[PDB]
Write an enzyme that holds these catalytic residues in place. Structure first.
Site, PDB file in Angstrom:
ATOM      1  N   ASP A 146       0.855  -1.174   0.000  1.00  0.00           N
ATOM      2  CA  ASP A 146       0.000   0.000   0.000  1.00  0.00           C
ATOM      3  C   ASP A 146       0.903   1.239   0.000  1.00  0.00           C
ATOM      4  O   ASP A 146       1.657   1.380   0.971  1.00  0.00           O
ATOM      5  CB  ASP A 146      -0.851  -0.013   1.257  1.00  0.00           C
ATOM      6  CG  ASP A 146      -1.753   1.216   1.275  1.00  0.00           C
ATOM      7  OD1 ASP A 146      -2.735   1.122   0.514  1.00  0.00           O
ATOM      8  OD2 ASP A 146      -1.401   2.137   2.053  1.00  0.00           O
ATOM      9  N   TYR A 160       3.223   9.776   0.383  1.00  0.00           N
ATOM     10  CA  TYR A 160       4.186   9.227   1.307  1.00  0.00           C
ATOM     11  C   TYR A 160       5.637   9.475   0.890  1.00  0.00           C
ATOM     12  O   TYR A 160       6.537   9.295   1.674  1.00  0.00           O
ATOM     13  CB  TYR A 160       3.960   7.711   1.439  1.00  0.00           C
ATOM     14  CG  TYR A 160       2.584   7.318   1.940  1.00  0.00           C
ATOM     15  CD1 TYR A 160       1.710   8.249   2.474  1.00  0.00           C
ATOM     16  CD2 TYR A 160       2.156   6.010   1.893  1.00  0.00           C
ATOM     17  CE1 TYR A 160       0.466   7.859   2.926  1.00  0.00           C
ATOM     18  CE2 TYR A 160       0.921   5.609   2.343  1.00  0.00           C
ATOM     19  CZ  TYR A 160       0.060   6.555   2.864  1.00  0.00           C
ATOM     20  OH  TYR A 160      -1.183   6.143   3.312  1.00  0.00           O
ATOM     21  N   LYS A 176      -2.797   5.783  -4.135  1.00  0.00           N
ATOM     22  CA  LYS A 176      -3.841   6.704  -3.857  1.00  0.00           C
ATOM     23  C   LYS A 176      -3.502   8.042  -4.521  1.00  0.00           C
ATOM     24  O   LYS A 176      -2.374   8.534  -4.522  1.00  0.00           O
ATOM     25  CB  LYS A 176      -3.970   6.860  -2.344  1.00  0.00           C
ATOM     26  CG  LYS A 176      -3.787   5.567  -1.571  1.00  0.00           C
ATOM     27  CD  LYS A 176      -4.082   5.642  -0.110  1.00  0.00           C
ATOM     28  CE  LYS A 176      -3.610   4.378   0.593  1.00  0.00           C
ATOM     29  NZ  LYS A 176      -2.131   4.395   0.814  1.00  0.00           N
ATOM     30  N   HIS A 196      -7.557   9.046  -2.217  1.00  0.00           N
ATOM     31  CA  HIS A 196      -6.951   8.876  -0.901  1.00  0.00           C
ATOM     32  C   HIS A 196      -7.815   9.378   0.247  1.00  0.00           C
ATOM     33  O   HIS A 196      -8.013   8.699   1.256  1.00  0.00           O
ATOM     34  CB  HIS A 196      -5.582   9.570  -0.901  1.00  0.00           C
ATOM     35  CG  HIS A 196      -4.650   9.192   0.202  1.00  0.00           C
ATOM     36  ND1 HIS A 196      -3.285   9.350   0.065  1.00  0.00           N
ATOM     37  CD2 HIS A 196      -4.808   8.667   1.436  1.00  0.00           C
ATOM     38  CE1 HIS A 196      -2.674   8.968   1.145  1.00  0.00           C
ATOM     39  NE2 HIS A 196      -3.570   8.538   2.019  1.00  0.00           N
TER      40      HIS A 196
HETATM   41  N1  LIG Z   1      -5.761   5.527   3.374  1.00  0.00           N
HETATM   42  C1  LIG Z   1      -5.234   6.367   4.231  1.00  0.00           C
HETATM   43  O1  LIG Z   1      -5.679   7.409   4.690  1.00  0.00           O
HETATM   44  C2  LIG Z   1      -4.230   5.775   5.213  1.00  0.00           C
HETATM   45  C3  LIG Z   1      -3.994   6.503   6.410  1.00  0.00           C
HETATM   46  C4  LIG Z   1      -3.071   5.976   7.344  1.00  0.00           C
HETATM   47  C5  LIG Z   1      -2.428   4.751   7.039  1.00  0.00           C
HETATM   48  N2  LIG Z   1      -2.735   4.129   5.816  1.00  0.00           N
HETATM   49  C6  LIG Z   1      -1.892   2.953   5.355  1.00  0.00           C
HETATM   50  O2  LIG Z   1      -1.958   2.049   6.476  1.00  0.00           O
HETATM   51  C7  LIG Z   1      -0.604   1.595   6.833  1.00  0.00           C
HETATM   52  C8  LIG Z   1      -0.609   1.165   8.285  1.00  0.00           C
HETATM   53  O3  LIG Z   1      -0.991   2.247   9.156  1.00  0.00           O
HETATM   54  P1  LIG Z   1       0.101   3.150   9.903  1.00  0.00           P
HETATM   55  O4  LIG Z   1       1.338   3.281   9.127  1.00  0.00           O
HETATM   56  O5  LIG Z   1      -0.645   4.401  10.235  1.00  0.00           O
HETATM   57  O6  LIG Z   1       0.353   2.455  11.342  1.00  0.00           O
HETATM   58  P2  LIG Z   1       0.277   0.954  11.902  1.00  0.00           P
HETATM   59  O7  LIG Z   1       0.540   0.039  10.767  1.00  0.00           O
HETATM   60  O8  LIG Z   1      -0.898   0.837  12.742  1.00  0.00           O
HETATM   61  O9  LIG Z   1       1.534   1.136  12.935  1.00  0.00           O
HETATM   62  C9  LIG Z   1       2.836   1.254  12.358  1.00  0.00           C
HETATM   63  C10 LIG Z   1       3.742   1.505  13.614  1.00  0.00           C
HETATM   64  O10 LIG Z   1       3.792   0.228  14.310  1.00  0.00           O
HETATM   65  C11 LIG Z   1       5.107  -0.217  14.509  1.00  0.00           C
HETATM   66  N3  LIG Z   1       5.078  -1.637  14.398  1.00  0.00           N
HETATM   67  C12 LIG Z   1       4.872  -2.410  13.284  1.00  0.00           C
HETATM   68  N4  LIG Z   1       4.892  -3.681  13.516  1.00  0.00           N
HETATM   69  C13 LIG Z   1       5.131  -3.750  14.885  1.00  0.00           C
HETATM   70  C14 LIG Z   1       5.248  -4.902  15.663  1.00  0.00           C
HETATM   71  N5  LIG Z   1       5.159  -6.167  15.276  1.00  0.00           N
HETATM   72  N6  LIG Z   1       5.487  -4.620  17.003  1.00  0.00           N
HETATM   73  C15 LIG Z   1       5.593  -3.346  17.509  1.00  0.00           C
HETATM   74  N7  LIG Z   1       5.477  -2.206  16.747  1.00  0.00           N
HETATM   75  C16 LIG Z   1       5.241  -2.488  15.408  1.00  0.00           C
HETATM   76  C17 LIG Z   1       5.891   0.379  13.336  1.00  0.00           C
HETATM   77  O11 LIG Z   1       7.277   0.545  13.730  1.00  0.00           O
HETATM   78  P3  LIG Z   1       8.501   0.364  12.655  1.00  0.00           P
HETATM   79  O12 LIG Z   1       8.005   0.747  11.321  1.00  0.00           O
HETATM   80  O13 LIG Z   1       9.606   1.270  13.232  1.00  0.00           O
HETATM   81  O14 LIG Z   1       8.965  -1.129  12.761  1.00  0.00           O
HETATM   82  C18 LIG Z   1       5.239   1.786  13.231  1.00  0.00           C
HETATM   83  O15 LIG Z   1       5.750   2.625  14.270  1.00  0.00           O
HETATM   84  C19 LIG Z   1       0.202   2.870   6.442  1.00  0.00           C
HETATM   85  O16 LIG Z   1       1.603   2.723   6.462  1.00  0.00           O
HETATM   86  C20 LIG Z   1      -0.425   3.244   5.106  1.00  0.00           C
HETATM   87  O17 LIG Z   1       0.093   2.347   4.119  1.00  0.00           O
HETATM   88  C21 LIG Z   1      -3.627   4.581   4.855  1.00  0.00           C
HETATM   89  O1  LIG Z   2      -3.334  10.090   4.886  1.00  0.00           O
HETATM   90  C1  LIG Z   2      -2.583   9.178   5.106  1.00  0.00           C
HETATM   91  O2  LIG Z   2      -2.507   8.077   4.396  1.00  0.00           O
HETATM   92  C2  LIG Z   2      -1.614   9.217   6.272  1.00  0.00           C
HETATM   93  O3  LIG Z   2      -1.668  10.539   6.827  1.00  0.00           O
HETATM   94  C3  LIG Z   2      -0.882  11.492   6.226  1.00  0.00           C
HETATM   95  C4  LIG Z   2       0.289  11.157   5.550  1.00  0.00           C
HETATM   96  C5  LIG Z   2       1.046  12.166   4.961  1.00  0.00           C
HETATM   97 CL1  LIG Z   2       2.466  11.640   4.123  1.00  0.00          CL
HETATM   98  C6  LIG Z   2       0.655  13.499   5.036  1.00  0.00           C
HETATM   99  C7  LIG Z   2      -0.519  13.847   5.714  1.00  0.00           C
HETATM  100  C8  LIG Z   2      -1.284  12.840   6.309  1.00  0.00           C
HETATM  101  C9  LIG Z   2      -2.548  13.184   7.042  1.00  0.00           C
HETATM  102  O4  LIG Z   2      -2.634  14.284   7.587  1.00  0.00           O
HETATM  103  N1  LIG Z   2      -3.657  12.450   6.767  1.00  0.00           N
HETATM  104  C10 LIG Z   2      -4.873  12.823   7.434  1.00  0.00           C
HETATM  105  C11 LIG Z   2      -5.873  13.451   6.456  1.00  0.00           C
HETATM  106  C12 LIG Z   2      -5.567  13.922   5.191  1.00  0.00           C
HETATM  107  C13 LIG Z   2      -6.538  14.554   4.384  1.00  0.00           C
HETATM  108  C14 LIG Z   2      -7.821  14.748   4.925  1.00  0.00           C
HETATM  109  C15 LIG Z   2      -8.094  14.332   6.227  1.00  0.00           C
HETATM  110  N2  LIG Z   2      -9.380  14.561   6.707  1.00  0.00           N
HETATM  111  O5  LIG Z   2      -9.571  14.178   7.869  1.00  0.00           O
HETATM  112  O6  LIG Z   2     -10.237  15.100   6.012  1.00  0.00           O
HETATM  113  C16 LIG Z   2      -7.125  13.713   7.020  1.00  0.00           C
END
Ligand SMILES: NC(=O)c1ccc[n+]([C@@H]2O[C@H](COP(=O)([O-])OP(=O)(O)OC[C@H]3O[C@@H](n4cnc5c(N)ncnc54)[C@H](OP(=O)(O)O)[C@@H]3O)[C@@H](O)[C@H]2O)c1
Ligand SMILES: O=C(O)COc1cc(Cl)ccc1C(=O)NCc1cccc([N+](=O)[O-])c1
Length: 315
Positions: free
Chosen positions: A43, A48, A77, A110
């Site tokens: 993803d 990013y 996205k 996104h």
């Molecule tokens: N669609 C969108 O708006 C959106 C928004 C937010 C996120 N996402 C996607 O969702 C993915 C996952 O969410 P996220 O990045 O917010 O956070 P997450 O996956 O909930 O948490 C990642 C954090 O957890 C730590 N971690 C990972 N595996 C671990 C384990 N086994 N034990 C302890 N700590 C661990 C990682 O550390 P390290 O990396 O240092 O190992 C990092 O600090 C994102 O990277 C992105 O691809 C999409």
């Molecule tokens: O969105 C993600 O996947 C992770 O969050 C990121 C990542 C980057 Cl690299 C930059 C900014 C953000 C962030 O502020 N996302 C939150 C977001 C954005 C737009 C609208 C909303 N909203 O609530 O309408 C929230």
């Protein structure tokens, strides 16, 4: 079942690798290792600002003959500053170029919120309010449909859309493609029962992001609840001889959701994949769903006045 059937006839891996906050200095290694231990879904997002480095790892493992392109499910996205219909193709093609790919398996809007186009990804006004763009979900969706009809993406979907926003697309006159996926935040403090019920009932697959509660989120506070440290969940983990993270990743899988935990730590990338060898019991599931606190890691107060802010609605 490692993959879920999408409405375009393609199969999507239910566990993917998140890459938000994976530094460009470390994400190439992350993706290489992930591919090595079985991840096929990555993803990504332009925002990013690591898609080059993700493409580096992918081309290399293609080069190494570890995986073939058809086996990978690569998600990116459309960032918020590119919702204008005349910007979408270019935004997709930049992602494609950075990723050194010729198509995406899935391309998501996104966020439903369009922001003012320009170089700056998250333009705020003086006052810390986001500067929106005069764009709307349906025209952006039409722009996304074009991507499919041009062969650049096999499937399109949405992210952070509430059920009414999804419904807008569904009821679009002249709809060409229904959204294949709705990617939403989802974990035991935000269990999303009603949106999941809605999406599934409409044949839309749901992807749970931030399943570990995003401890590395740049806006975290000390007072926030911390999923990974929650003693109640450690307790569940301990009973199954699994890590808390593994419990948190397994939980959405048993809800027929896709989940995309992020790590750049090789040990954890591997750890996080080892979730197809245990089951959470009825009571575990019930208990974890009961920890819902409607708590969001992703909810930008700077966007609470955007017309398309998704989180005013109950779901
Ligand atoms: N669609 C969108 O708006 C959106 C928004 C937010 C996120 N996402 C996607 O969702 C993915 C996952 O969410 P996220 O990045 O917010 O956070 P997450 O996956 O909930 O948490 C990642 C954090 O957890 C730590 N971690 C990972 N595996 C671990 C384990 N086994 N034990 C302890 N700590 C661990 C990682 O550390 P390290 O990396 O240092 O190992 C990092 O600090 C994102 O990277 C992105 O691809 C999409
Ligand atoms: O969105 C993600 O996947 C992770 O969050 C990121 C990542 C980057 Cl690299 C930059 C900014 C953000 C962030 O502020 N996302 C939150 C977001 C954005 C737009 C609208 C909303 N909203 O609530 O309408 C929230």
């Amino acid at each position: 079942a490692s993959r879920i059937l999408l409405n375009n006839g393609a199969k999507m891996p239910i566990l993917g690798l998140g890459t938000w906050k994976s530094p460009p200095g470390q994400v190439t290694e992350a993706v290489k290792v992930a591919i090595d231990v079985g991840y096929r879904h990555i993803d990504c997002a332009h925002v990013y600002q690591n898609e080059n480095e993700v493409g580096v790892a992918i081309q290399e493992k293609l080069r190494e003959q570890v995986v073939k392109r058809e086996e990978l499910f690569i998600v990116s996205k459309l960032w918020c500053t590119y919702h204008e219909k005349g910007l979408v193709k270019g935004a997709c093609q930049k992602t494609l170029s950075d990723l050194k790919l010729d198509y995406l398996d899935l391309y998501l809007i996104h966020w439903p919120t369009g922001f003012k186009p320009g170089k700056e990804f998250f333009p705020l006004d003086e006052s810390g309010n986001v500067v929106p763009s005069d764009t709307n979900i349906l025209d952006t969706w039409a722009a996304m449909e074009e991507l499919v009809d041009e062969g650049l993406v096999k499937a399109i979907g949405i992210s952070n859309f509430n059920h009414l926003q999804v419904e807008m697309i569904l009821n679009k006159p002249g709809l060409k493609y229904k959204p294949a996926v709705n990617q939403i935040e989802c974990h035991p403090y935000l269990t999303q029962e009603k949106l999941i019920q809605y999406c599934q009932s409409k044949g839309i697959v749901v992807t749970a992001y931030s399943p570990l509660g995003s401890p590395d989120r740049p806006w975290a506070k000390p007072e926030d609840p911390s999923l990974l440290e929650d003693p109640r969940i450690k307790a569940i983990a301990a009973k199954h001889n699994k890590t808390t993270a593994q419990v948190l990743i397994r939980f959405p899988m048993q809800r027929n959701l896709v989940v995309i935990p992020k790590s750049v730590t090789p040990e954890r990338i591997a750890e996080n994949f080892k979730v197809f060898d245990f089951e959470l019991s009825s009571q575990d599931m019930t208990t974890l769903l009961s920890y819902n606190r409607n708590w969001r890691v992703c909810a930008a107060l700077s966007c609470t006045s955007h017309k398309d802010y998704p989180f005013h609605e109950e779901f």
